[PDB]
């Protein structure tokens, strides 16, 4: 059970997952909830390893039928244990990607329905963002399954970073490379920040159209490239992008290279699909220098953008939350434009885990291991307690994922082997299972 | 006329020496034979039979010539090893 951080050598377990299995003659499944990630880590597996039979399952049909190392979605994984698949015989060590999703209810109940319902011979290999509740999770899956495990933690980052605040074009360091809370600088920033009716947009927050290039160009004189910015709203991403002008990250040769590379991507589709307005704009942006990444963009637009950025060409980027889950990363700096977002319910501050997943991504590894981070503030005071619960605060504990889907119930009552009650009472919610069942 | 001779008349013509492509049009009259379709096509009787006059074909008895008549497939599982 790996409790570590991304962009800090988490693939060490993924490297020996196949390398052990390929010599010893077992198989391995890499199980990621996001489809983009599946493609990403597939690419990674193609790259790093030396002649390995890799595979990836999609809706239409499987790429590489006779694969040694398959890749699949959690839903598709679940569809082995109910259907009776070929590769639950051959697989021994199943890899599990990102089990800090173990808190989220709406999607992540599949992990309870698969990990607890795995076969007897199959054993656990996990990968996750750091959490304080380490002992309780692994031991639970250990105790119920009756499998020996160790808490392989990674409490502090071997690839660290520093965190700053933006105010009147300034870098005010609240936290440095060694993770020391500077109380004086926080005092400093607020002391600096001491008839406009709402005709268009809200009266305060969201900066002017010639602020963004000021933010950009100032960092390019100091030369803290590459940088990334995290804008949430899909309209606002576009808006905050299109205000920028006079800025090109590729020379006339590299521009031509970009043109050629896009020309491959476009070749797949029809002329009607090639000449989309969205793709035209995208083409312009890539040629211009920068790019955008939100879920509202198309599959061919997103993945391509991710590649071209990760090639090391685009050094200023605008992107969503899900973008943080990537493969290759040229980022010396990561910036938060806002700390507000609308995840289903309403206005809610981003949880410390989310802060980590995003801000902890800012390290390079193999150039400058101490990464830069700067949070934006547009002529307004920061809420100290909230800020520190986001910045310093602990990523909250793993909360149980129970959601009785009727399909599951129908499957179980059809199959009848392993009855539903037995599943239910022994499920993740603890009660004389992990703690103190000998005293019964 | 036979197909063979027609095939052969075209096969006698050799290559041409333009490189370039050229488009030659046929000289075929689509249109003497006025009484071809009139005195044959309609009044000639059916070589096969029309499905309108395939009503006197069969009758379908219920009994085959019971219980064992329906279930011929009934059987014990395969030999145990």
């Amino acid at each position: 059970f790996v409790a570590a951080h991304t962009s800090a050598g988490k693939t060490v377990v993924a490297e020996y997952a196949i390398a052990m299995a390929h010599r010893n003659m077992t198989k391995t499944i890499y199980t990621s909830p996001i489809k983009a990630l599946s493609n990403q880590k597939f690419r990674d597996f193609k790259e790093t390893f030396d002649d390995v039979n890799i595979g990836l399952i999609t809706g239409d049909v499987q790429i590489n039928p006779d694969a040694n190392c398959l890749i699949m979605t959690t839903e598709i994984l679940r569809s082995m244990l109910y259907r009776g698949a070929d590769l639950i015989r051959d697989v021994e060590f199943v890899i599990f990607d990102e089990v800090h999703y173990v808190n989220d209810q709406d999607r992540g109940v599949v992990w309870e329905e698969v990990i607890i319902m795995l076969p007897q011979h199959v054993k656990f290999i996990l990968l996750s963002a750091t959490v304080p509740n380490t002992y309780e999770f692994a031991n639970w899956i250990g105790r119920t399954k009756q499998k020996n495990i160790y808490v392989i933690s990674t409490p502090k980052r071997p690839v660290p970073l520093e965190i700053n605040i933006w105010a009147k074009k300034e870098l005010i360091p609240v936290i440095n490379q060694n993770s020391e809370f500077l109380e004086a600088n926080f005092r400093k920033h607020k002391e600096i920040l001491n008839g406009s009716n709402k005709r268009k947009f809200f009266t305060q927050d969201g900066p002017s159209k010639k602020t963004w290039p000021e933010i950009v160009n100032y960092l390019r004189k100091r030369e803290l490239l590459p940088m990334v910015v995290f804008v949430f709203s899909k309209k606002r991403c576009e808006e905050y992008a299109d205000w920028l002008e006079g800025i090109n990250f590729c020379n006339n040769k590299e521009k031509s290279q970009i043109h050629m590379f896009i020309e491959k991507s476009i070749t797949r589709l029809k002329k009607e699909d090639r000449d989309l307005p969205q793709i035209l704009k995208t083409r312009s942006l890539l040629e211009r220098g920068i790019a955008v990444h939100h879920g509202g963009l198309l599959p061919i637009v997103k993945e391509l953008i991710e590649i071209l950025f990760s090639k090391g060409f685009i050094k200023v980027l605008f992107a969503t939350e899900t973008f943080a889950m990537g493969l290759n990363l040229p980022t010396r700096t990561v910036i938060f434009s806002s700390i507000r977002k609308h995840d289903g319910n309403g206005l809610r501050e981003l949880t410390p885990g989310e802060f980590t997943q995003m801000a902890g991504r800012a390290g390079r590894r193999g150039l400058d291991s101490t990464g830069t981070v700067i949070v934006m503030a547009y002529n307004s005071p920061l809420s100290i307690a909230t800020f520190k619960e986001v910045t310093m605060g602990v990523p909250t504990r793993l909360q149980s994922q129970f959601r009785l889907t009727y399909n599951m119930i129908l499957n179980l009552l059809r199959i009848e082997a392993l009855r539903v009650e037995e599943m239910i009472k022994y499920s993740f919610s603890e009660n004389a299972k992990e703690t103190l069942q000998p005293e019964h | 006329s036979s197909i063979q001779e027609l095939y052969q008349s075209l096969k006698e013509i050799t290559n041409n020496a333009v490189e370039l492509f050229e488009d030659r049009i046929t000289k075929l009259d689509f249109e003497k034979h006025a009484n071809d379709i009139i005195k044959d096509r309609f009044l000639r009787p059916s070589n096969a039979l029309p499905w309108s006059l395939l009503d006197m074909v069969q009758d379908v008895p219920h009994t085959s010539s019971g219980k064992l008549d329906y279930k011929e497939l009934l059987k014990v599982p395969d030999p145990i090893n």
Partner: protein, 148 residues
């Protein structure tokens, strides 16, 4: 009574979030409207039956009918005919990636239903499902995976 296109578009109601500010346009054909009505009725019935027992549903399932899911019928129907991606985009209100995702999930559904259709019996239904599964799977909807 429906055609494959009509079926697949009808099935879009389930595989879409339906949280947006803009208004729903008029429905593309009366049969689809009828189908929608039927669906609404069935979901009302289900809500009633759940409500007698007094068990709390999820925020998604509690909302369902209140949420703006029904506009994507008019969207995907045209795609199911055999139309350009710009034309459909200029009909629809929502972003393009979202639409693509919805289309994908409809492929998943038609697959799921196809098996079930076979199981139940009606071969015409299965054919319709597979007619839909033929038409929707093309071009940008299932483009290249650029990570090979």
């Amino acid at each position: 009574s429906f055609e494959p296109e009509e079926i697949v578009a009808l099935l879009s109601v389930f595989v879409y979030e339906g949280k947006t500010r803009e208004e729903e346009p008029p429905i593309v054909t009366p049969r689809l409207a009828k189908g929608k009505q039927r669906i609404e009725e069935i979901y009302k019935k289900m809500l009633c039956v759940f409500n007698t027992h007094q068990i709390p549903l999820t925020q998604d399932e509690a909302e369902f009918l209140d949420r703006k899911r029904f506009a994507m019928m008019n969207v995907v129907y045209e795609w199911a005919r055999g139309l350009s991606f710009k034309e459909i985009m200029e009909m629809s209100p929502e972003a393009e990636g979202t639409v693509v995702r919805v289309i994908t999930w409809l492929d998943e559904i038609c697959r799921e239903v196809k098996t079930a259709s076979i199981i139940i019996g009606n071969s015409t239904l299965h054919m319709k499902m597979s007619r839909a599964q033929e038409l929707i799977k093309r071009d940008i909807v299932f483009a290249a995976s650029l990570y090979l």
